[PDB]
Design a protein around this ligand. Structure first.
Ligand SMILES: CCCCCCCCCCCCCCCCCC(=O)OC[C@H](COP(=O)([O-])OCC(O)COP(=O)([O-])OC[C@@H](COC(=O)CCCCCCCCCCCCCCCCC)OC(=O)CCCCCCCCCCCCCCCCC)OC(=O)CCCCCCCCCCCCCCCCC
Ligand code: HEA
Ligand code: HEA
Ligand SMILES: CCCCCCCCCCCCCCCC(=O)OC[C@H](COP(=O)(O)OCCN)OC(=O)CCCCCCCCCCCCCCC
Ligand SMILES: CCCCCCCCCCCCCCCC(=O)OC[C@H](COP(=O)(O)OCCN)OC(=O)CCCCCCCCCCCCCCC
Ligand SMILES: CCCCCCCCCCCCCCCC(=O)OC[C@H](COP(=O)(O)OCCN)OC(=O)CCCCCCCCCCCCCCC
Ligand SMILES: CCCCCCCCCCCCCCCC(=O)OC[C@H](COP(=O)(O)OCCN)OC(=O)CCCCCCCCCCCCCCC
Ligand SMILES: CCCCCCCCCCCCCCCC(=O)OC[C@H](COP(=O)(O)OCCN)OC(=O)CCCCCCCCCCCCCCC
Ligand SMILES: CCCCCCCCCCCCCCCC(=O)OC[C@H](COP(=O)(O)OCCN)OC(=O)CCCCCCCCCCCCCCC
Ligand SMILES: CCCCCCCCCCCCCCCC(=O)OC[C@H](COP(=O)(O)OCCN)OC(=O)CCCCCCCCCCCCCCC
Ligand SMILES: CCCCCCCCCCCCCCCC(=O)OC[C@H](COP(=O)(O)OCCN)OC(=O)CCCCCCCCCCCCCCC
Ligand SMILES: [Ca+2]
Ligand SMILES: [Cu+2]
Ligand SMILES: [Zn+2]
Lengths: 113, 102, 51, 59, 269, 120, 534
């Protein structure tokens, strides 16, 4: 046991700095209230009505494209437009499946002839 | 650092009087010979009287050895040995050539 | 975790107090480095039919 | 429910390595080590064919 | 606390991590992944079963690494103020590097489009290519993303304020909004009239928007990790660092997608 | 037998650094579930005390063998970087005073002494 | 033992693994350059039986090993991880588990590059890997894939390590040390870490897109789908040039410490040295297309890149004159580290002056794929960065290891590499100016003269490397005896003129950085009470 074992290691506490730290935990606690409450209002008065009218406008435009897909599904491969030089590049077959189709390949709209 | 030569001597004269052991006399002497100038004769005299007060003869011999390295000619070395004549004689300091003659 | 201190304690290989001489480890390690280009040449010259 | 404090005292008074202190850690670590061995050995068992130019006969 | 008691605690705030097996187990999974993919892309391995296993082991080995960071901060108390500040700064340098990966993909797009090659028709887009129209399903996506950067703002500030229910609801909604974005790109892909095989146009288009697709799947995994931790009382009103890193992530991905939508969809079509 | 410490003077090792858990239905507080060195650094903040030392070297004067500059340490040594009396007077020079020998600067002659306070 | 070196979270132990791997790799890359120089000794088939693909394979392996597996894991992975935390007072690095994965990916990247040369025919493409020569039509099979995965694993290594270096410097400095008080070597690893962070992600875009053309039917660079090979070169060289500076700047900071120690003078104009290192790191992002002067760019594009390349000579020349100003008026001590530093100042200036000629686009028409270029970048990389790596090892290894080395054996080693390096690379300029192309295993008969001279010097320099391998053995078996006999240097600074022998024993070390004040092998717990400076 050294003689120093029972002597203070820090010094006099700073009661001023203990209050600045203490007052800053309440200012931020309530400033987050006047800030949070507005962003609930914004999320229901702007954001929600945007995902409302856009969705039906998107449903309408998407509903039309489904019939256009239904007409192409009846077109036989004789009058499918001929590929250009840069279309359907096959430098070597894909190493999965049959070697000719991609990941999101859709037979109705994508074809190799 | 804008220190004139006159301010250089008056500051190292003060610095040799305050040195209180061998470490201090050797450290102050090292810094005094590390500038782009040869210290004045009145600075060399105070460095000899500081090594006497700590009772060390080799430090007083090395003072004149550094002096012969720092001068430009050998006639500048001679004119110092002709100014500090009494002090080298009164304290009993030999020259390194006189001590190890070749 | 607590480790030891000293001279031969901060390296992963043993230099002293070993049965086999340390020269076999030191120069064997740098011999294998110098020898991998020649193994590659051997495989490829044995593929071209040169050997 | 809240179990932060209870797990706080289990963890801080344990001698085992960190990844072993939770009572449920045996069920993850035992099967992972077996799976980790298969996933490392098997690709290595194919370099001999790759150097020799033998290809798998998936046909 | 005298000198005797102060001796039982560290003299610096920084974190001394104990030895762990994870850093060298992740490296082996990375080599098993590299060796398997090259061998199956060229026929030396019959199927994709070995590539599947290497991806599964790279995944469950990072989980365990993340599992040991939860315990060091929630059950051990090792994340002091200085450790917290260093973690935030490391994450900002991570996203700056990921942002410049997209910067290289935008160079490739502009190189191919400002003076298009004559085998295309000297025209952008090339002849015969039917592109994605902006005022469509991609316009529903740019609203769904902008709508999640404001429901995540009120969840974060409801946790600082001590409101639990409001905090837990503004995160369960951000989750299902990023999930909706992800399946909306899936529909847009299986219906597009061109493919990544369709020359240089299908290459720069699906690279820029396909990388962003992969980050969103990673972003939805982060909000699910925060959901478990906030509901099970790990996050406190002043100490939630796993949450702020997620929040900064949802805002950078929002800006990147904004750029993709203006260049790949409005200017390049 | 053990109980949660309330102030820095009540801390007795690491088993008094575990708080009271938050009750069901509320957002936990820092004072409810912090532990370890992170909790000790918070107890000091509330009272106004810095538990990690971060002040620079005292360059008010030049120490001497009669009146050195005292340096505190929790070991038998500490590294000291001297740059002169008004800080920045000369090129920095690193030193290492020990419990048995003082340190002197070969550049300016400043003397530093150690003061051990650590308890094994 | 298992968990100290496979589970490590200590930055000193990890730095030792880096150096072990770095030196094992310079063996292989030197053996490949020796096989290359034997086949170039005379006209005709010499040793490879006319297999030109094999000669091209060994050239790629030579460049990848020297750059990504020797110079980066030693200057940065080794010296940066060992001396940066000690020079700023840090108890560790930030993120100690990130620090460990950034090493263990390099062994896995070596068992990817080595198995690339043994499969099918290897990658005979050059270290730049231009398409379409590197696509599946002109390079079939899995060799170029396995080389790309090797490059991916070195990018994960350098990026993760750079993020760790940046956080540690900004967050974990000791009491009183501000950013203006950092040692110059700490500044050199900090600036290098930012160049890696902003250039590596552009290279990962380029070579992943090359992997997609080969295996996934994509046309980034294929000409039949609309793609462009010249796009790849823009993406590759936008990382390339920043890389050459990622390789010289850490050596700039080593040279600063060595020159100041063996002069007994502080670095002249220390603050303008940091400003110059930052200006060179910024101007290294605006000059990349001096590597594409003849591919058909516009004349106004080429006139911009000329002037941008030339003005990096101004900040670099400030560092050259600054180093000559600190040794002027000094007290020079000619130990082995000081010999390399004086040779660096002379051989780096020569290599940099041949770069000023290359900087003009008009003159580069006679300097494209010419041995003259090969002569330029072996003067700044092999008598430059390599000479600074030797200077570092002889400077810090006695402290790091606790073991001294045979001094007079080390001065023989220095002279054998100085003589032999000059013999290989000086005649390379003569071949290039007369018009000899690069990347050929065989040449017309008029080039036989200088090609024989260079192949002789290649044997001189490999013998100097084998002497260095013996010096390592002697230091590890006889290091403690080298301290008591007179076979090694004990003090890198000697007593001052008027300082006596016994006063000198009070303070043996007069250092302006912490590292020379530790125990000889530094303790595994180096700081408990933080170091303090004014
Ligand atoms: C699936 C993910 C894995 C998580 C669950 C697996 C195991 C379940 C445990 C069951 C045991 C139990 O009772 O647990 C209760 C346990 C109680 O814990 P507690 O009381 O709070 O305290 C326990 C301790 O904290 C610690 O708890 P613990 O020690 O008991 O374990 C907690 C957890 C480890 O805790 C963690 O830290 C988990 C962190 C995982 C991060 C997930 C991200 C990655 C997944 C995303 C997938 C794709 C991403 C790819 C990115 C894109 C780029 C291409 O354990 C593990 O998961 C260990 C690894 C599993 C074993 C590995 C070996 C396999 C053989 C067995 O609670 C949990 O189950 C917590 C699990 C964590 C939930 C994370 C939620 C995932 C995020 C949402 C995903 C949605 C993304 C989809 C995208 C949308 C596109 C359509
Ligand atoms: C790090 C860079 C580096 C280094 C050190 C070297 C070193 C050498 N290089 Fe090479 N070289 C390159 C980088 C380098 N080279 C690059 C990028 C290319 C172009 C590739 C391309 O064309 O595609 C190239 C190309 C190249 C060619 C062109 C071949 C052709 O075009 O096909 C030749 C020809 O002779 C050659 C020769 C040499 C020789 C003889 C040495 C020897 O002189 C080495 C001399 C000195 C040493 C023996 C090394 C020191 C040994 C160590 C292990 C250091 C250990 C130190 C410590 C740990 C303290 N190099
Ligand atoms: C350490 C690596 C390193 C360094 C530091 C440099 C530094 C420089 N390099 Fe180099 N370079 C390479 C590595 C390096 N290079 C490699 C590997 C290649 C080939 C890549 C490949 O094809 O594989 C290459 C090729 C290369 C090219 C492409 C040429 C071609 O391929 O056809 C050019 C073009 O301008 C170039 C120029 C310069 C210039 C101007 C500097 C300047 O920074 C030099 C400045 C230094 C000085 C000028 C010396 C001191 C200055 C003074 C004392 C000031 C007074 C001077 C004057 C008033 C003139 N070099
Ligand atoms: C082959 C011998 C087997 C003998 C059979 C055992 C019978 C008992 C004999 C006792 C010997 C036990 C054998 C254990 C293995 C062993 O001690 O040396 C064997 C070790 C191998 O093992 P490794 O742990 O280094 O891992 C590596 C395995 N790949 O060689 C070596 O690395 C030699 C390496 C020396 C060269 C490094 C020089 C670097 C010096 C450090 C300088 C650092 C500067 C840092 C600056 C930043
Ligand atoms: C070399 C791989 C070792 C990684 C560390 C590790 O695999 O861990 C080591 C673990 C357990 O040891 P433990 O560290 O979890 O401690 C446990 C304290 N009770 O055993 C294994 O996994 C065995 C896995 C087989 C390795 C074969 C594949 C080698 C490649
Ligand atoms: C190391 C740093 C990474 C740098 C990365 C730079 C370049 C990355 C850009 C490409 C990223 C993947 C694109 C998304 C897939 C896509 O392309 O979308 C999918 C496309 C679109 O479907 P479709 O063509 O059938 O048309 C639809 C008509 N109905 O299908 C394909 O492609 C099939 C081929 C699979 C492509 C997978 C390629 C994986 C290799 C790269 C892995 C990701 C890189 C690392 C990311 C963490
Ligand atoms: C196919 C395989 C792919 C695998 C990739 C999976 C990626 C999915 C993302 C899962 C992230 C889980 C992190 C939670 C850990 C945690 O707990 O963080 C919380 C901790 C604890 O602090 P606290 O505030 O909770 O304190 C509690 C109160 N005292 O703070 C932190 O550590 C902050 C650092 C988090 C950063 C995580 C890493 C993010 C980048 C990883 C990117 C990897 C892929 C990159 C590919 C290009
Ligand atoms: C080929 C397909 C691409 C795969 C990508 C490569 C995969 C390698 C890494 C695998 C993920 C395992 C988790 C490790 C990361 C981690 O755990 O970060 C968590 C670390 C843990 O800090 P600590 O434990 O060190 O300190 C102890 C303190 N508790 O928090 C940090 O550092 C803070 C900064 C976060 C930065 C993370 C960066 C993400 C890493 C991936 C970077 C890849 C860049 C290249 C992109 C192509
Ligand atoms: C730090 C970041 C540094 C950013 C670099 C920007 C400096 C550009 C100066 C030169 C520009 C010039 O003058 O380029 C002129 C040339 C003209 O080419 P041309 O002759 O074929 O014109 C013939 C016309 N038919 O355009 C180029 O080559 C394109 C280069 C643009 C540079 C893009 C950089 C994008 C950075 C992404 C990476 C992010 C990380
Ligand atoms: C035209 C291009 C010139 C290129 C020159 C490059 C040569 C490189 C070699 C450099 C080695 C010499 C170091 C510089 C000497 C020095 O240290 O100078 C610094 C000293 C220190 O003065 P001070 O601080 O004490 O006083 C305060 C001073 N303001 O002042 C001198 O000595 C003056 C030098 C003469 C000026 C140069 C005239 C050139 C004609
Ligand atoms: C070639 C060998 C020629 C023999 C020379 C004998 C030296 C005379 C002597 O015995 O010299 C004594 C010195 C001791 O130096 P000293 O100062 O104590 O004695 C001098 C008194 N004034 O030992 C040596 O020089 C050893 C010399 C070794 C030379 C290289 C050894 C082989 C290195 C290559 C192999 C390693 C690479 C393998 C890995 C791929
Ligand atoms: Ca030949
Ligand atoms: Cu360049
Ligand atoms: Zn001083």
């Amino acid at each position: 046991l050294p003689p120093n074992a029972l002597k203070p290691a820090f010094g006099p506490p700073d009661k001023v700095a203990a209050q600045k730290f203490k007052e800053s935990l309440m200012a931020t606690e309530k400033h987050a209230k006047d800030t949070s409450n507005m962003w609930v209002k914004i999320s229901v008065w702007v954001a929600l009505p945007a995902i409302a009218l856009t969705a039906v406008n998107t449903y309408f435009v998407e509903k039309e494209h489904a019939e256009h897909r239904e007409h192409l599904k009846h077109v036989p491969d004789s009058e499918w437009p001929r590929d250009y030089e840069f279309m359907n590049i096959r430098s070597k077959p894909f190493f999965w499946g049959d070697g000719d189709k991609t990941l999101f390949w859709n037979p109705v709209v994508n074809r190799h002839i | 650092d804008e220190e004139t030569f006159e301010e250089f001597t008056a500051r190292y004269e003060k610095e040799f009087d305050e040195a209180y052991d061998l470490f201090e006399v050797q450290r102050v002497l090292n810094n005094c010979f590390s500038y782009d100038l040869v210290p004045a004769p009145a600075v060399i005299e105070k460095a000899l009287r500081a090594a006497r007060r700590v009772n060390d003869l080799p430090t007083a011999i090395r003072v004149f050895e550094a002096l012969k390295y720092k001068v430009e000619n050998e006639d500048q070395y001679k004119a110092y040995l002709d100014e500090l004549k009494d002090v080298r004689q009164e304290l009993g300091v030999p020259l390194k050539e006189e001590l190890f003659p070749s | 975790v607590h480790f030891k201190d000293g001279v031969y304690e901060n390296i992963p290989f043993k230099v002293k107090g070993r049965k086999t001489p340390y020269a076999l480890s030191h120069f064997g390690f740098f011999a294998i480095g110098f020898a991998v280009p020649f193994v590659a040449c051997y495989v490829q010259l044995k593929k071209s039919g040169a050997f | 429910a809240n179990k932060v404090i209870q797990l706080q005292k289990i963890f801080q008074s344990s001698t085992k390595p960190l990844w072993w202190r939770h009572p449920r850690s045996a069920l993850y670590l035992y099967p992972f080590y077996a799976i980790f061995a298969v996933a490392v050995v098997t690709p290595l068992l194919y370099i001999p064919n790759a150097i020799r130019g033998i290809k798998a006969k998936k046909a | 606390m005298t000198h005797l008691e102060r001796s039982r605690h560290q003299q610096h705030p920084f974190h001394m991590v104990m030895p762990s097996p994870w850093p060298i187990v992740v490296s082996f999974a990375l080599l098993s992944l590299a060796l398997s993919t090259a061998l199956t892309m060229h026929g030396y391995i019959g199927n994709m079963n070995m590539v599947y296993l290497a991806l599964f082991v790279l995944l469950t080995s990072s989980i365990l690494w993340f599992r040991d960071i939860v315990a060091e901060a929630t059950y051990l108390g090792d994340h002091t103020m200085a450790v917290r500040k260093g973690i935030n700064l490391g994450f900002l340098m991570f996203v700056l590097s990921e942002v410049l990966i997209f910067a290289g993909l935008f160079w490739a797009y502009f190189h191919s489009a400002m003076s298009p090659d004559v085998t295309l028709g000297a025209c952008w887009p090339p002849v015969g290519i039917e592109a994605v129209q902006p005022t469509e399903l991609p316009l529903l996506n740019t609203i769904i993303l902008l709508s999640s950067g404001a429901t995540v703002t009120y969840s974060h500030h409801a946790l600082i304020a001590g409101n639990r229910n409001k905090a837990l609801s503004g995160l369960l909604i951000t989750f299902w909004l990023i999930v909706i974005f992800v399946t909306c790109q899936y529909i847009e892909y299986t219906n597009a009239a061109f493919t990544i095989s369709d020359g240089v146009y299908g290459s720069v288009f699906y690279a820029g928007t396909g990388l962003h697709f992969l980050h969103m799947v990673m972003l939805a995994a982060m909000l699910g990790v925060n959901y478990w931790r906030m509901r099970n009382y790990h996050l406190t009103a002043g100490h939630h660092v796993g949450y702020e890193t997620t929040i900064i992530y949802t805002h950078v991905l929002d800006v990147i997608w904004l750029f993709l939508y203006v260049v790949f969809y409005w200017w390049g079509v | 037998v053990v109980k949660t410490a309330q102030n820095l003077a009540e801390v007795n090792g690491p088993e008094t650094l575990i708080g009271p858990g938050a009750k069901e239905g509320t957002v936990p507080t820092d004072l409810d579930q912090e532990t370890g060195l992170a909790r000790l650094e918070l107890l000091g903040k509330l009272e106004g005390i810095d538990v990690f030392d971060t002040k620079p070297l005292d360059s008010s004067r030049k120490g001497t063998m009669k009146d050195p500059i005292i340096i505190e340490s929790y070991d038998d040594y500490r590294y000291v970087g001297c740059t002169g009396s008004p800080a920045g007077s000369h090129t920095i020079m690193w030193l290492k005073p020990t419990v048995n020998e003082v340190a002197r600067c070969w550049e300016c002659g400043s003397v530093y002494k150690l003061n051990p306070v650590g308890v094994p | 033992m298992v968990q100290r070196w496979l589970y490590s979270t200590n930055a000193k132990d990890i730095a030792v693994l880096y150096f072990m791997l770095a030196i094992f790799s310079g063996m292989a890359g030197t053996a490949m350059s020796l096989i290359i120089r034997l086949e170039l000794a005379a006209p005709g088939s010499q040793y490879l039986h006319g297999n030109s693909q094999l000669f091209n394979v060994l050239v790629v392996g030579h460049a990848v090993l020297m750059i990504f597996f020797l110079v980066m894991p030693a200057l940065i992975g080794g010296f940066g991880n060992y001396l940066l935390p000690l020079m700023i007072g840090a108890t560790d690095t930030a993120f100690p588990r990130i620090n460990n994965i950034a090493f263990w990916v390099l062994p896995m990247g070596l068992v990817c590059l080595v198995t690339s040369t043994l499969v099918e025919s290897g990658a005979g493409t050059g270290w730049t890997v231009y398409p379409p020569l590197s696509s599946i039509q002109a390079h079939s099979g899995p060799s170029v894939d396995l080389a790309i995965f090797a490059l991916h694993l070195t990018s994960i290594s350098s990026l993760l390590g750079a993020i760790n270096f940046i956080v540690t410097t900004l967050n974990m400095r000791t009491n009183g040390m501000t950013m203006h008080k950092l040692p110059l070597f700490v500044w050199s690893i900090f600036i290098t870490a930012f160049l890696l962070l902003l250039s590596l992600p552009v290279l990962s875009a380029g070579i992943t897109m090359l992997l997609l053309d080969r295996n996934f039917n994509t046309s980034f660079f294929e000409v039949s789908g609309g793609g462009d090979p010249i796009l790849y070169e823009h993406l590759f060289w936008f990382f390339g040039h920043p890389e050459v500076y990622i390789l010289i700047i850490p050596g700039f900071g080593i040279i600063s410490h060595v020159v100041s120690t063996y002069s007994k003078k502080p670095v002249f104009g220390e603050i303008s040295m940091v400003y110059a290192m930052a200006s060179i790191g910024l101007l290294g992002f605006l000059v990349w297309s001096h590597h594409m002067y003849i591919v058909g760019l516009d004349a106004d594009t080429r006139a911009y890149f000329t002037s941008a390349t030339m003005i990096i000579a101004i900040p670099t020349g400030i560092k050259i004159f600054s180093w000559l100003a600190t040794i002027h008026g000094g007290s020079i001590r000619l130990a082995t580290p000081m010999l390399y530093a004086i040779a660096f100042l002379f051989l780096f200036t020569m290599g940099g002056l041949t770069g000023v000629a290359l900087a003009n686009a008009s003159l580069d028409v006679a300097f494209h794929d010419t041995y003259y270029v090969v002569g330029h970048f072996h003067y700044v990389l092999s008598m430059g960065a390599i000479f600074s790596l030797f200077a570092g090892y002889y400077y810090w290894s006695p402290q790091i290891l606790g073991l001294n080395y045979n001094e007079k054996l080390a001065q023989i080693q220095f002279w054998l590499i100085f003589i032999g390096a000059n013999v290989i690379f000086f005649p390379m300029h003569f071949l290039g100016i007369n018009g000899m192309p690069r990347r050929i295993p065989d040449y017309p008969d008029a080039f036989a003269g200088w090609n024989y001279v260079a192949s002789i010097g290649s044997f001189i320099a490999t013998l100097s490397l084998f002497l260095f391998i013996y010096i390592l053995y002697d230091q590890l078996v006889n290091g403690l005896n080298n301290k008591v006999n007179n076979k090694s240097v004990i003090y890198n600074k000697a007593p001052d003129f008027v300082e006596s022998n016994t006063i000198f024993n009070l303070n043996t070390v007069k250092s302006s950085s912490i590292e020379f004040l530790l125990t000889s092998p530094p303790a595994v717990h180096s700081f408990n009470t933080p170091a303090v400076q004014s």
